[PDB]
Symmetry: C3
Subunit: 366 residues, 3 copies
């Protein structure tokens, strides 16, 4: 059978599965729903949450910290990310394709320095106190959320700050703002931009696979400490419409892919819903949707438009890409004849012959 | 709202939440109840149990082993801890403030060498077979518990020991003792005290924070192997009555604190009971009570008496202390003006000014 | 009380607890049932599954890959194991007593080169996507299972392979085979045998314990990378009928033992079904049965026939063997007199005397 869209567990449609935590004229912050909820075939993803952030030009996400580690990737645009610690501040500008880990509890803030290009960010979260959920703690005081300092008693805030509660409530609490995302004057932005491990960029190196129809960029834990702690890989691949990414599977990594821009059909061959029968999963992906590719499941992606997609690899270290067709990295073709002769009905010379036909690799026609 | 005592999830009152496993004229052994039971905000603490031990002078806890690792800390007094292995014995005297890991399965015993000072021990347990519970296996045979050797059949015990079951049952089983804690003659104690990684001491080094009102001692995994395996930190801080430990939060470590001696009010600002509203948690702590401070939650402690408290830091490596007031380690004050100007209603110069007022650090008045 | 066979949780009778996934004239593939299902005393084993494979001479297990790491051990016979990767093939012959890790997702196959000796394999599995279950994905197409390539649409398979779906369905799909285990001509086998970390062997080194009645072979993570990743040990011990393996316990490792050949009675002293009462667990083990020995539980094995058994040690690093009787590795006898004098009713000199009697070690009479 072919589980499609609606009843397909791995397809995560944007405007249905995301939950908006905040939204206004300058941006929105929404969280994808829990994975494990939908299927035990994704049990091990329960410790992770996907977060999407949209920010209009010249705006700022007020200071706050969550109780989760954060892998931050910039899908489109450029933002100035700032981390502050009890002993010091640290800022960097991030171009599209850049990433950076945000230790759990690190107060920080973002601003879209640009004057007309929007900011799009994907965030992989890993909660501390509870595997399935995290808590943002906002320092600011706005009509939307309340400052966390406002959670302490007068006696404390008074002693802590040395001042009558009144002087405090005036300066720090109730002339404010209405949301956690506020616009700034270009003068102000220019101010906090003269400062701008540390952020690294996936699309800044020899891609892994490449050809007329598409290129594949990937960065692994082996070559990056921040990535090695999360034990995960970043991956970004763009294909021309009409392209096909040949059926392949990841050795042990579980993949969370998000569609940056473009359209595409995905075919995933996996487990049904303790037998050996295999079921097919299909879905049409579009901008922002999320699709989960379980470890070892064979998958094929078809770009029915010029698209580019980001993928997080959970449980990545020493993961391998096994292509079931084509020349490069084609496990199928490493099986000695005498075996595939018995594997498939046809004769080994015939099966092989069939295999060796498609002289292309990874990114072919359609 | 302000969840207080009774309905506050993180407050663990001594005489209600502890479960006594043994008790007599010379001591008691009780276990704190499971954390995760009370709130999903403490899900990740489910793998840990707190154990309290009280021992009158000149007594001994008979030989046994549990199926859990054990972080042993001596709150008050001094005890002689002995570990025995198939290839050898190892003993050390531990003064108050000392700690030492006890590998799971290591048979051991404790004795209070002292002649009039009681022994108080806190124990952080990490079970093996079951995440939530551990099993003590006592070698001794007393009216309280039964020897585990008594669980084997006659045919085995006979072959294993070479002797009729009768000679065995006499020597090893049913002239014995009534409890697992027995008193000894000073002569006997003096005997097992001439022997007395290895035990380390938290209160034996430059404290982290210090002033007229209090000092803070902390030892981290970075600087201690035993601690690095458990990936946790030990911490001990004493404050003068009237003192206040300024609102602060730990970057990623979850903290299990126990009150050694003294009284104190605690204010913890955390999550309610998937929104951004913040709730306040309050409670009055007294000798032996246990309070759990979730990672990243802002907390303030007030010593309404001269107290000293121990704290275990779970998930400690690279954890950071963010103070929301005061001079030292005050994240608030590392945020550039132009930002806190937009963060809080008042002007940046005013907010800042307010911040820079309290010239004290961590331990202030009240 | 004495929980026996039927109601004993740790006893896993072969023909009742195994589930056959495939079976024919040349072999069978069956999976043991989930551990945690039967008792919370085995909660931490939930991430593991036991797999048994039987293969008649001169046969082959067709190509496939599962979504689980695999510790492969050859109980009896010799098989030629082949791993294929997108960049290359790797084969080795394995004699009885050999082991080797099979990374999750690595396509592979086995063949019994021998001409009259059967192949017996035990497999410890560690699933990726779901802690409790794994998925075999077979490349072949047979009346039993269906090829996973048959899960992709015509448009894909066509583009992926460059050929009308018809030519494909003929060569790769529906002259085939009826099962995943097929027999081969000696000519064929001889073919794939001229190639034959890498496989290591437990029974190829100074045993740990040894004497007239039996020897004990063990290999630990300290001395083997593959083993260090799984953080587990391999162990193989053969005893003469009438022998007794003296009551002992593992410090922190949980042990999954399987009976290769022979008969034996096992006595395990563990927890009942939060008190200190101890219950006894007994059972008669026979060829292929599986018995689980929880960390720190005292156990005694009696060979009521000449047997040999394999054991996997989960959570093995720095694990210790504490013998409660005998000379070598007898914790009991490391306890100083003055203590065992108070531990047991009898006098220390008497208890000790009793202890020092049995001059044998590990493997004694009965």
């Amino acid at each position: 059978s072919v589980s499609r869209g609606k009843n397909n567990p791995f397809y995560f449609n944007s405007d249905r599965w995301f939950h908006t935590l905040f939204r206004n004229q300058f941006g929105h912050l929404r969280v994808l729903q829990r994975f494990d909820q939908r299927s035990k075939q994704m049990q091990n993803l329960e410790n992770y949450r996907v977060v999407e952030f949209n920010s209009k030009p010249n705006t700022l996400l007020l200071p706050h910290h969550a109780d989760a580690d954060f892998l931050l990737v910039v899908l489109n645009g450029r933002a100035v990310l700032t981390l502050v610690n009890p002993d010091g501040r640290d800022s960097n500008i991030l171009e599209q394709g850049h990433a950076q880990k945000i230790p759990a509890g690190t107060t920080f803030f973002l601003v879209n320095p640009d004057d007309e290009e929007n900011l799009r960010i994907i965030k992989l979260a890993v909660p501390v106190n509870n595997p399935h959920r995290f808590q943002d703690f906002f320092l600011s005081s706005t009509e939307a959320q309340q400052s966390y300092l406002q959670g302490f008693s007068k006696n404390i805030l008074e002693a802590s700050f040395d001042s009558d509660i009144k002087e405090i409530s005036r300066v720090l609490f109730g002339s404010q703002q209405e949301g956690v995302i506020v616009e700034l004057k270009r003068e102000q932005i220019r101010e906090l931009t003269k400062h701008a491990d540390q952020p690294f960029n996936l699309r800044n190196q020899k891609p892994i696979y490449s050809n007329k129809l598409g290129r594949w960029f990937e960065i692994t834990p082996e070559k990056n400490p921040q990535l090695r702690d999360l034990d995960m890989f970043i991956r970004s691949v763009d294909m021309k419409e009409g392209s096909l990414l040949l059926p392949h599977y990841n050795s042990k990594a579980i993949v969370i892919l998000v569609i940056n821009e473009g359209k595409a059909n995905i075919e995933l061959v996996g487990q049904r819903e303790e037998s050996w029968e295999v079921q097919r999963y299909r879905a049409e992906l579009s901008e922002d949707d999320v699709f989960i590719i379980p470890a070892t499941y064979p998958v094929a992606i078809n770009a029915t438009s010029n698209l580019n997609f980001f993928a997080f690899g959970i449980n990545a270290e020493n993961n391998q890409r096994n292509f079931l067709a084509g020349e490069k990295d084609n496990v199928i073709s490493e099986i000695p004849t005498e075996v595939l002769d018995v594997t498939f009905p046809a004769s080994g010379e015939k099966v092989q012959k069939l295999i060796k036909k498609q002289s292309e690799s990874q990114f072919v026609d359609a």
